[PDB]
Symmetry: T
Subunit: 137 residues, 12 copies
């Protein structure tokens, strides 16, 4: 199927003063998706409720999700539970290597329900997640 949802959570709108901005990340993702024959829909919110609604829509549409949940990765049971309804693949992405950072960042509520997880590969992590989904149609 063509459509892949890329959903970014809290503080990811701040990319590029936290070099690559979130707008630039959207552009990079869109270009790579077109190359792969996909259509990427990229969304970012600091609101858990908004993220939940986007995940609910992806469940109702049976669309795959690439999710970088920011701080809610480590803290939100609610976001996990929304993701548990997804029928298509869920790929967890983090820009930083969360396993090399504070202890609290080494625990994810999403990893057990995700198909797979990419961390520490920068923004290329998103592009690699897209290529997985393209080669897994």
């Amino acid at each position: 199927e063509l459509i892949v949802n890329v959903i970014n959570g809290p503080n990811l709108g701040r990319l590029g003063r936290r070099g690559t901005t979130h707008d630039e990340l959207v552009a990079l993702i869109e270009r790579e998706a077109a190359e792969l024959g996909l259509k990427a829909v990229v969304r970012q919110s600091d609101s858990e409720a908004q993220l939940l609604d986007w995940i609910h829509q992806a469940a109702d549409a049976a669309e795959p999700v690439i999710l970088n949940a920011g701080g809610l990765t480590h803290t939100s049971v609610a976001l996990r539970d929304a993701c548990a309804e997804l029928s298509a693949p869920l790929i967890e992405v983090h820009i930083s290597n969360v396993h090399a950072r504070e202890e609290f960042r080494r625990h994810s509520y999403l990893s057990p329900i995700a198909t797979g997880v990419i961390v520490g590969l920068g923004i290329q992590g998103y592009l690699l997640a897209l290529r997985y989904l393209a080669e897994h149609v």
Copy 2:
């Protein structure tokens, strides 16, 4: 007093694809409340802030609350603290038996401040909570 607040948290709007829908649950609750001589006000949100506001209103009105907080049961100190202001009974309800599921679901921030807790009895749990409140006027 006639009025009981029934407040549902994250992902409870998704009932009936997660058979009984949330609209149907509202109908069942309303019917049982009328039978018991009560009026039930049933509300659902995926927003912690919205849930907090509803709990604040119930505190200011000295109205009892039946609360199924969804994932925030396990995670939100803020929701607990809002519930601590309530003067009337607080009944915690979960549809599933949270004690039979993942370890993280066996811990609730609400149970220590609730009057009581019903889990694992399905949607009938709400109806049983209503009957407690009716027989405790």
Copy 3:
């Protein structure tokens, strides 16, 4: 610099039925700030996303922050991460002595990134935080 942000999180709007109201707290802070030659901007929200936006603005303006995050003190990685972007001082304040209360309240995601922390001194804690910032220009 003149401006200091005072940001209150969940349930702090309920001060004075939880004697001093939040409006009164704003007045007290404003008066003390004028005495110190500062301008205080006091804001309160029960919404994590709203708190994040206010912290983002303070980062972009290089303004100091006095933050009483309420229940999110103990639970929100996202709020921590927003505060990590601040270049000016961050002073954590709690009205109650959180170290004398439930175990879960003795852990803060903010303390490790804050300049300093004041707890248990009541509403005067805010005024003392302001005086620190004034004497540290």
Copy 4:
């Protein structure tokens, strides 16, 4: 006919700090109406213009009105004139015995155009007004 309008004027939203709240009053009225085979539509406003619009709608629908106009009972010719257009019964209700209070409260612009008046019987006054209308179909 099934429908009865119950219209409350200024300060009646403050019931229960001025024990029974306005929400509770609505619940009590609704329950009694169902028992009587009626449907009660209960509305409250501190705005004369809003009350006038509700009375205008009841005139256009030929629906009966139970009206507790609050302070406007004693002061508003405009509200009287709107009520003069009603074709169905108008029942004036006051919770307090207005004849036992200040002199200005013993004069009503509505009493001369009302079918009848109940005062001093508490919130039961509304329920008794409903029973009149039910037995007068």
Copy 5:
């Protein structure tokens, strides 16, 4: 000057079920004004505050006012006081002969500050008020 304000108060929107409707009254006034070389601006509200704002605008513009205040004729000091600021003529109009009706309708807060008063001549009263203003330029 060309412009005359015609301002109708409470219950005057109900003309023609209380034969001529308020829309028809506007049409009649507009036609007569054009014949007289004037421009009539006709407005109606059940809101005292709205009437006050229209009178305030006419004061700031030094425009004459034809005012049929409905029930507020007999009751509103506030409307009187707004009219006291007018520099151009104020003509009070009532469709019915208020002196032939209930005692309370025979007292007007506006008559002492009006240039003159027309009552009991029907809707033609407005047209006669316009002709006064035209012949008094």
Copy 6:
């Protein structure tokens, strides 16, 4: 307590064409309040319903009120009744000496429930009311 509410009713927005404007009056009040160690919150409306809501808020906050109700002084039972709920002092102020004017202005629905009344001292009346409240803490 720091906060005092100053509430102006109908036509008081027109000050300074009815020299000192309402904006200027707000400035004068704010300055005097700061001198006295108070915070003044000054509001004006031509809407009775809006005034009622502001008085309701002051009742719920146990804050004192300085009220110049304009024409509603003489006419509104509803405004009186809202003021009767206040627990802190109510000071009635009029700029003009109402006892030297028309007979209808010599009767107030508010005076019997007010702590005290200042009339005829101009805009300084407000400043004197503030000084009373400051010396009565």
Copy 7:
């Protein structure tokens, strides 16, 4: 009575690229109405629901209607039924001679309930409909 409603349906906003524009048509109608001692209220919509609401208002006001329903002439039972409630005359107008065009345009749901019908006389058809209504008062 002065008021006549002129109601245009789908595609009539496109006049003057489909020479005379709809704005110009409104102007022509208004001028002719003034000459005849009438007031014309001219409205156009591509929305059936909006047309229905305008017809409902004309029924409640007992005002005559000149209706050029565009394509809905041939297709809408709902519009017919709304027009059946009118007590004053209904004049059907079409700019083009619908009887000289496609077969489907030679059938109207409105003609059987209209007083009369004018087709093929251009925009003058509206002006002639107005003159009928003026001479039939």
Copy 8:
């Protein structure tokens, strides 16, 4: 299941000047539904698009529908097609006996896809449709 949707189309808001009003019809339906152990959700629109959305929601919820489509009964393929998605029963209702009226009213796009059809039994037709659905659970 408890919930039944009752959907009324064009001109059904005009009931009771076209004796029983639409508000009264809602009341009658609600009462009968409660007696039968159901919950009725009654909606009316003159907009085809709005009716389509309500039918779409009933399809997604697998809820039964009682539909009186007004004039669109005879004309709308789109409404038919929306109803074809319903999995629960569809009961077509008309207040009037459409088979005794104009020829065009004797053809329905909905009858072939409806479970059954009630016509000519007045407003009781709705109540009888509800009783069918209750006895067919």
Copy 9:
């Protein structure tokens, strides 16, 4: 010219529960358009008035239209008439073979004014319509 409008009418938003969703259809169209050197603007509405406005815009821009009008294909003269203003090609598309279905679906108000018509080729019908327009520049 680059731009082609693809306009879908009633019930086409329901694709993929009526496998391919409307979002997916948009993606497929966009990709094929880019391959052909075109830009496709894809819009869907259940509102006739909205469809009319989109067709009006395409007329004013002299842009070609691919139109799948859903049920309005068979019923709307208004939509036909809007399409008659188009100067660029109009291609009618239906996913299903309408000639193999109910008799009423074998009649189209659009076919006589369309350049051409594709039916029964699924969603590929849209892509084939795009390729026609690209090879006809």
Copy 10:
């Protein structure tokens, strides 16, 4: 053609404290237009963008324009360029004799593209511009 646009730019809303107000000017223009068999549409804005939009509409409608651009007369190339699209006459009007004032006011970006220019004849300048257009049909 009947319609003439009269467009006023910055500071022209302030007429009558800068005797005749802008409202009065509108009235005078409307009356003169009716006498001449025209319809005048009079608009005023302090926003260049708003003026541009009004000129764009007049270009699309092939309607004549009487333009008093205020200060933008001397400064705005953008307004000139919008006026260059007009096909019907453009008449430039100024109330004051701009040639007798500061040097900067003696240069207009509009005069070279206008049909003609009237200055220094007061508000009658507009009426004379209207009479030109009427006699030039």
Copy 11:
């Protein structure tokens, strides 16, 4: 009089990346005003129309204005003309020494109508303008 308007034009919201921010400038001005016994109202816009409205309000209130018009200093006749209506002092301020910069910045439309002008003294220029107005009451 207490009130002074401080109005900033285009690009002045960008202060502190173009050290002192606009928020900080507001704070500095407010503090200095309080010291001088004044109340400063500080506003900034990139919209000429918005600046014009603020100047219009200051004219109607007979309040003094400190104006740093940004680029419109050199270009806007409209802003000049609005300022010409002011009866109280107008003080022109620029942060930079405009006489040391490009030739076009050495010409101001405002200087000839201003009381006086301060340039090149930084943000202190505003504070010095305030002190002028305070010593000139």
Copy 12:
């Protein structure tokens, strides 16, 4: 970097009646950008303030700008000053050869601060500006 801003000023929305429309220009730019590996964000406004905000965003994002400012090219110091904050390249584009037209069009406030300028090459000028930026990364 991928993103380039293309910003069009006054009257550029009117392209294609002033053959290629603004929508078509957007399409052409988008296609060329994709070919070059860029993402173009194309915006048009007749509002100087809106253009300023878009330039401010591009400054904060360190994104390059292709700017065709329309008439403001020749007149706006404010727009120049906003562009002076840009750190990435600024390319000035005009469709027409401004040096062959009126004298006032041969002067630009933007040229001295732009990297470079393209005029007179039609809409291809934008595409050539994009190719510069792509080859200058």
